[PDB]
Amino acid sequence: TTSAVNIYNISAGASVDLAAPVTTGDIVTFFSSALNLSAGAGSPNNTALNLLSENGAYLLHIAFRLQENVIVFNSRQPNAPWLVEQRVSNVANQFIGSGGKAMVTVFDHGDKYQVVINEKTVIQYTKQISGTTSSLSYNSTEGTSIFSTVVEAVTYTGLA
Amino acid sequence: TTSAVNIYNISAGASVDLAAPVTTGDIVTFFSSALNLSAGAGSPNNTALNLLSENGAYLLHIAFRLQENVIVFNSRQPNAPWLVEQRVSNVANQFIGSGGKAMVTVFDHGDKYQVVINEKTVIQYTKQISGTTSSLSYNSTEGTSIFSTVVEAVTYTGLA
Ligand SMILES: CC(=O)N[C@H]1[C@H]([C@H](O)[C@H](O)CO)O[C@@](O[C@H]2[C@@H](O)[C@@H](CO)O[C@@H](O[C@H]3[C@H](O)[C@@H](O)[C@H](O)O[C@@H]3CO)[C@@H]2O)(C(=O)O)C[C@@H]1O
C-alpha cells in the first residue's frame, strides 16, 4: 500500500546493488535501447541478465545465445555448479514486435519467475533457489551483445 | 500468478483503449523521452495524463501547469463537474534527477492511487470515483507540453 520505484543504469559487465530488494510479487524490467540479432557469437552468451541473492547466488540467469539460437534460464549457488537449465528456442521470434529496442520483464511470483519479452511471456521458470534479489548484473561477450552497452532497469517493489 | 505486460504508444491528443484493464494492484507507467520545464503556458494544462473508466469517467486526471507552477489531481464522472482537486506545488522539484526524460507511475492501491514521478512519490491520492481503468489519454496544450509528442505506456496487470 506504499510501493516504490527504483531506476538503475547498468553498464555491460557491471553489477548494481538494489536500494530495495526484489521479493515475491515485485517486478523488474530491463530496458534496452538497441536490438542486434545479427551481432555475432557469444562465449557462449552474447548477453546475460542475472538476479542475484545477497549470498551471491544466481537466483535467475538469463542468457541469449545467437550462435546457438537459444535463450537459457538457470540458477546456481555461489561457487557451486550450474543447475537444471531450461531453454527457449529461437531468439528473434521473441523480439518480434520490437523495432530497435527491447524490454525484458521478470515477475517474482514467489515460487516462480515469469519472464516476459516485450508483451510475450517466454517461460514460467520454477525457482531452483529461493530468496530475495538484492543485486543484478548485465554481462556480455565483447562487442556481440544484443542489447545496448547500457541497459536501464526499473524495479517495482512493495506490491504484495 | 500469470501477469501481463502491455505496451502502448500514446500520441498527444490521443486516447487508447487498454487491451487489459488496470485494476486494484495493477501498475501503469508513463514514459516521456523529453522534459521541458520552460515550455510555456497551459490552457490551463500544459500536459494531462488521464485514467478513464469504461463509462468515460475520469478515474484520475493528472495535470501539469507550468505557469501556475503546480500539478493537479482530480476526478469526475462523464458530463458532470470537476470534483475535489488535490495539488502538489512546484513542478520542477518533482523532476529533479531527470535529465531529458521522465516517467510517471500510478499504482492502483484499490482504494487509492499512488503517483510516482521517477523515484519520488508525489501524492497518495484517494479515489473519489472507483472502478477499473479501461483507457488512457494524453492531452496537451498546443506546443507547450512538458513531455515528448509521443508518450510510452507500459501496464502491468494480473498482479494481485
Ligand atoms: C570460461 C568459462 O567456462 N566460464 C563460463 C561461465 C562459468 O561456467 C560460470 O558460469 C561462471 O560464473 O558460464 C558462462 O555461462 C554459462 C551459463 O550460461 C550456463 C547456463 O546454465 O551454461 C554454461 O554452459 C553450459 C551449457 O549451457 C550446457 O549445455 C552444458 O551442459 O554445460 C555448460 C557448462 O556449464 C555457460 O558457460 C558465464 O559467463 O556465466 C559462460 C562462461 O564461458
Ligand SMILES: CC(=O)N[C@H]1[C@H]([C@H](O)[C@H](O)CO)O[C@@](O[C@H]2[C@@H](O)[C@@H](CO)O[C@@H](O[C@H]3[C@H](O)[C@@H](O)[C@H](O)O[C@@H]3CO)[C@@H]2O)(C(=O)O)C[C@@H]1O
Ligand atoms: C475550455 C474549458 O473550459 N475546458 C477546460 C476543461 C473542462 O473544464 C473539462 O475538464 C473538459 O473535460 O478542463 C481542462 O482542465 C481542467 C482540469 O485541469 C481541472 C482539474 O480538476 O481544473 C480545471 O480548472 C479548474 C481550476 O483548476 C480550479 O482552480 C477552479 O476552481 O475551477 C476550474 C474549472 O474546473 C481545468 O480547466 C481540460 O482541458 O481538461 C482545461 C480546459 O480549458
